[PDB]
Amino acid sequence: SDPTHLISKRAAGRTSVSDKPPANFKPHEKPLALSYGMPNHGFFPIDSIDVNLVDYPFQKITPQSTVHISRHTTDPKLIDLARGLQYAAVEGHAPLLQFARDFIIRTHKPNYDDWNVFITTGASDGLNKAADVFLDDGDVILVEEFTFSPFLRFSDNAGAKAVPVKINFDNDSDGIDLTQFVDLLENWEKHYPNLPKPKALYTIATGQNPTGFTQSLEFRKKIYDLAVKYDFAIIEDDPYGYLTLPKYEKPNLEIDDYLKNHLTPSYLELDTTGRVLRVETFSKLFAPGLRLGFIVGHKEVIDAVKNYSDVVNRGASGLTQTIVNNVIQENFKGVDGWLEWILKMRLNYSYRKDLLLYSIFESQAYKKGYVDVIDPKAGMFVTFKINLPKDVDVLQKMKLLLWKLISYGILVVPGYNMTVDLEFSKDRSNFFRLCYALANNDEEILESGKRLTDAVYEFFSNGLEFH
Amino acid sequence: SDPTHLISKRAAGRTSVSDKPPANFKPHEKPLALSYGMPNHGFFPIDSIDVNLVDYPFQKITPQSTVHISRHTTDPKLIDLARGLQYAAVEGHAPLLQFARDFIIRTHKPNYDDWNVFITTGASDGLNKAADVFLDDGDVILVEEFTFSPFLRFSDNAGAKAVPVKINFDNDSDGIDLTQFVDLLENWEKHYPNLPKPKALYTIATGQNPTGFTQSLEFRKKIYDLAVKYDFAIIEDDPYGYLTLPKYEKPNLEIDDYLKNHLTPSYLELDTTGRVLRVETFSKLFAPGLRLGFIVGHKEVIDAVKNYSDVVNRGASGLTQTIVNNVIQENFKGVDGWLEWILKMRLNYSYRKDLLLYSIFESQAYKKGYVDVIDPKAGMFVTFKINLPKDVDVLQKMKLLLWKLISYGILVVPGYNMTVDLEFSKDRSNFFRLCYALANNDEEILESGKRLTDAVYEFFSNGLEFH
Ligand SMILES: *Cc1c(COP(=O)(O)O)cnc(C)c1O
Ligand SMILES: *Cc1c(COP(=O)(O)O)cnc(C)c1O
Ligand SMILES: N[C@@H](Cc1ccccc1)C(=O)O
Ligand SMILES: O=C(O)CCCC(=O)C(=O)O
């Protein structure tokens, strides 16, 4: 079982990075190099780096935890500065590639053997790789109608067309409306008569950007079976699926439990043949300034993406791979230590969501029926629904209400900024995306949702004007 | 004038990342965010970093030089970890953009006002951006017949055809044979009747990879003048031009005197219109594993390069910008101090090149006339000529001698591995590139040239066979 068929003409056809030696030849057993254009490590200005950490989020400065990064190391699980600040295999340093093979064995084991990982400069990097590796010029990619907008620059670069896939906005939505999704495929010729059959599905199955929704283990089985039947690849994008949130309890967990009953399976777990490419990032779990991530796919998909990175992004920062790999191994003692740090963030992220939602639930705006809120199963985004009258112009009134938000002093992202096709999605655009991740503290969350709901109350009180 | 016309249709065509305020719309003064999917810095497992530096190349274990990176600082010459580990502008952090401008005003002041820098992930990343910003499908790029081979994949990715420009191998040589360069251009339709007029030149003008040649100031004026006449862009690649080398003396400097008299001027110093795009890297001067560099070009070229980054390479590591920005500002006290560290390395690479040449000059292979070396004027590479009888097969006998080089225990790079077009350049392929950047010490240089000379002698003593 292999996905060679799914891999692009463009990506397949890029070349790999010299014969029978003479009869009486043996290599010399310790040779010297006049070959590669590499400054010897003695040239590097950095001798050692001390990385000073925290035991938990929001802690202010038991003594401080420290990882020392020395010029040289014998530990096969650490990266020294001698290799870390030197030229490296583009696919990544071996210790960080291994930490990720194990992390994925622990959290989302692929249902087949011939899989591999590949260090990236983040999710967006990972998506652009996934787009290049699966889309030729003229292909259609299936994109969730409200999506992570940048993806369309990577599909558009690979020359593909984003066909939009309707989201169900019910409080129990999996996200993607399975019925309108089955119809699109069954009746492709009827909907898009002048476009080829879709090549791929770009889905943010868990903590969907920006809707909030998570696809259940039974919904994924169905989508995967649609992937096998109509033979399309799955680009899975999971930057914060590890941040599982329990459903709203009014405000004011061990590794085996989380892994067994809190964390929703990844499409990697359903995949037998390598038609799933998974995109991961250290952005929302460590810091966004790393520009570090990894993808998981079939050995031959990762190979193609290697040849692409050889052209457009020749390696993640080795100093960053060094600082991040050694913090995860020395401080956090590997896979299970990193899940314990991921779980600390869970509680914080968990507490914040519930606060923003309480914030909203006490408002006259919620009580009067003007706004509702989807309860996100994971991540850092809430869908904030605006119950405008049906007959009014969604885009016109949402634009006018955005200026009202900005005048009351609450910035949000409107739904209509996150579409594949604004005409296709205008009627389901009556929503702002809230993110409770950036705030400094609990009082900001409270004040944030006070203003958001105060503004919406004036907007409606005023009869949907700025009066 | 300006180089708007030189910007590729493809690069020009990317979008740069909208309704009228209502009547009396005052924005709120101090507003809150539920907008961006940015974790608050409080979520970052790193609180501070100490970077432990050497003060001269090859030092061992004076209080030791160290730089403290705090979560917060008000110094506008520094980057804290609050900004540095957070989503950042794709062009780079303002302190590091500022150092690059200043570094460049000091060293290679462009000859016009309308230029800018941009943070890259090294020279290979710069050159890809350059290839993209200047070349459409079916465009032609002139490339030195022996070159940095990876460049071809960038040009190939841009849809462009690489025409080779001949190298003169005279010990005299500027590199590019200017006589055959002026011919190619004057009589283009006799040379390549199928192909458009060249869109650009790729030139490693100082310390040419691999040949080692440096173009004089007056030879660059001639190249620049051909560039205005035939209206092509110049992609100037300079990874080691700063490491100027005094001509050979038998072995065993003040900033203003280096700047004023040792450093060969950059095409930037000739450019009046924005024709020139300069590729800088921290690879060879600091460390390769940073994946950090920058480009100098016209404001309109760099905007284009920005929109391309937005697609394929969303910014250098912030953590790496942070460690490099601060090391250079705190420890080295800015531009003049960084040039003082560049001068320390200069002295090393200087002593190394001469030890290598001394080692070659004292051998029977040199003395018998079986080899010769070019005195390079900058960088970390040497053309080692192999005087093969004119009528033997250059490639056949060179692949043979390489096998002999490997059996005697010296790894070198054959020139025939660094061609645009192997058949076009076969007759000038009778040379290996030597690099003295990688050796741990002087002893490794002298033993390196000993093994190189022993084998060329033995191979020549055997009759240009292995034996
Ligand atoms: C935040 C986010 C990203 C950004 O990933 P980077 O590593 O920051 O490029 C990508 N995809 C989704 C769905 C996100 O929410
Ligand atoms: C080493 C080298 C490069 C590569 O730069 P990176 O920053 O390592 O990508 C590019 N051009 C030349 C001429 C080089 O010698
Ligand atoms: N500045 C970010 C933009 C971004 C913000 C938030 C989420 C994702 C992306 C970048 O260059 O990649
Ligand atoms: O490190 C890589 O993957 C590519 C760097 C290419 C290079 O300049 C070199 O070979 O030294």
For chain A, give every domain's residue range: 1-467
- DSSP-derived pairing of the beta strands A371-373 and A381-386: antiparallel
β-partners of residue A118 are A295
CA distances from A302 to A4, A12, A115 (A): 11, 11, 9
Six-digit token string for B393: 């097969």
Could you give the angle at the alpha carbon of B314 between the alpha carbons of B309 and B315, nearest 5°? 100
Cis peptide before A210 (omega within 30 of 0): yes
CA separation for the pair A192, A195 (Å, rounded)? 6
Is there a contact between A307 and A11 (Cβ–Cβ < 8 Å)?
Answer: yes
CA separation for the pair A128, A312 (Å, rounded)? 10
Q: Do B316 and A317 touch (CB under 8 A)?
A: yes
A35 lines ligand 4 (CB under 6 A): no
Six-digit token string for B215: 């173009």
Dihedral-angle region of residue B141 (phi above 0 means left; psi in -120 to 50 means alpha; beta otherwise): beta
CA separation for the pair B87, B96 (Å, rounded)? 15
* Burial class for B276, CB neighbours closer than 10 Å (0-12, 13-18, 19+): buried
Q: Which of A322, A38, A122, A48 is nearest to B281 (CA)?
A: A38
Q: Any residues with CB less than 8 A from the CB of B285 and at least 6 apart, and which?
A: B240, B242, B342, B345
* Residues of chain A contacting B434 with CB distance shorter than 8 Å: 34
- For this experimental structure, what is the resolution in angstroms? 2.6
CA separation for the pair B326, B317 (Å, rounded)? 14
Is there a contact between B279 and B126 (Cβ–Cβ < 8 Å)?
Answer: yes
Enter the DSSP assignment of A234: E
Instruction: Say if B59 is an interface residue toward chain A (CB within 8 Å).
Output: yes
Which residue matches tokens 């974790």? B39
CA separation for the pair B191, A43 (Å, rounded)? 45
CA distances from B432 to A6, A29, A169 (A): 42, 22, 66
Mutate to test the interface with A, among B18, B25, B34 (most CBs of A within 10 A): B34
User: Method used for this model?
Assistant: X-ray
CA separation for the pair B9, A132 (Å, rounded)? 21
Q: Any residues with CB less than 8 A from the CB of B198 and at least 6 apart, and which?
A: B140, B141, B142, B163, B185, B188, B230, B232
Is there a contact between B436 and B349 (Cβ–Cβ < 8 Å)?
Answer: yes
A209 lines ligand 1 (CB under 6 A): yes
Looking at B316-461, which runs of residues are DSSP E strands? Answer: 371-373, 381-386, 410-411, 413-414, 431-435
CA end-to-end distance (rounded Å), chain A:
64
CA atoms within 13 A on the CB side of B463: 1
Enter the DSSP assignment of B47: E
CA separation for the pair A307, A12 (Å, rounded)? 9
Is there a contact between A421 and A164 (Cβ–Cβ < 8 Å)?
Answer: yes
Alpha helices in A113-158 (DSSP H): 123-134, 151-157
Six-digit token string for B118: 């941009």
- Residues of chain B immediately before an interruption (C to N > 2.5 Å): 17, 61, 252
B368 lines ligand 3 (CB under 6 A): no
Q: Do B57 and A51 touch (CB under 8 A)?
A: no
- DSSP-derived pairing of the beta strands B46-53 and B66-69: antiparallel
Nearest 5°: phi and psi at B107?
-100, -40
Nearest to A327 among B45, B436, B451 (CB): B45
CA end-to-end distance (rounded Å), chain B:
64
CA separation for the pair B59, B43 (Å, rounded)? 37
- DSSP-derived pairing of the beta strands A200-203 and A140-144: parallel
Q: Any residues with CB less than 8 A from the CB of B160 and at least 6 apart, and which?
A: B131, B135, B136, B137, B138, B139, B140, B141, B199
Is there a contact between B36 and B87 (Cβ–Cβ < 8 Å)?
Answer: yes
Is there a contact between A401 and A387 (Cβ–Cβ < 8 Å)?
Answer: no
Alpha helices in B208-363 (DSSP H): 217-229, 255-257, 267-270, 299-312, 318-326, 335-361
* Burial class for A165, CB neighbours closer than 10 Å (0-12, 13-18, 19+): buried
Six-digit token string for B411: 């790894």
Give the residue, out of B36, B314, B317, B319, with the most ligand 1 atoms within 8 A of its beta carbon, to mutate for a pocket test. Answer: B314
- Give distance in angstroms: CA of A178 to centre of ligand 1: 25
Which residue matches tokens 């594993």? B289
A144 residue type, one letter: E
Is there a contact between B438 and A40 (Cβ–Cβ < 8 Å)?
Answer: yes
Residue B149 marked as a ligand binder: no
Q: Among the atoms of ligand 2, which is closest to the Cα of residue B124?
A: 9
Six-digit token string for A318: 């080795």
Nearest 5°: phi and psi at B262?
-100, -45
Six-digit token string for B176: 């590019």
Q: Any residues with CB less than 8 A from the CB of A467 and at least 6 apart, and which?
A: none
Instruction: Say if A17 is an interface residue toward chain B (CB within 8 Å).
Output: no
- Give distance in angstroms: CA of A128 to centre of ligand 3: 14
Q: Do A46 and B323 touch (CB under 8 A)?
A: yes
Give the residue, out of A87, A306, A321, with the most ligand 4 atoms within 8 A of its beta carbon, to mutate for a pocket test. Answer: A87
Ligand nearest the Cα atom of residue B204:
2
Q: Do A435 and B399 touch (CB under 8 A)?
A: no
Is there a contact between B126 and B154 (Cβ–Cβ < 8 Å)?
Answer: no
Q: Do B451 and A32 touch (CB under 8 A)?
A: yes
CA separation for the pair B242, B346 (Å, rounded)? 8
Dihedral-angle region of residue B212 (phi above 0 means left; psi in -120 to 50 means alpha; beta otherwise): left
* Residues of chain B contacting A446 with CB distance shorter than 8 Å: none
Cα B339 to its chain centre, rounded Å, is 17
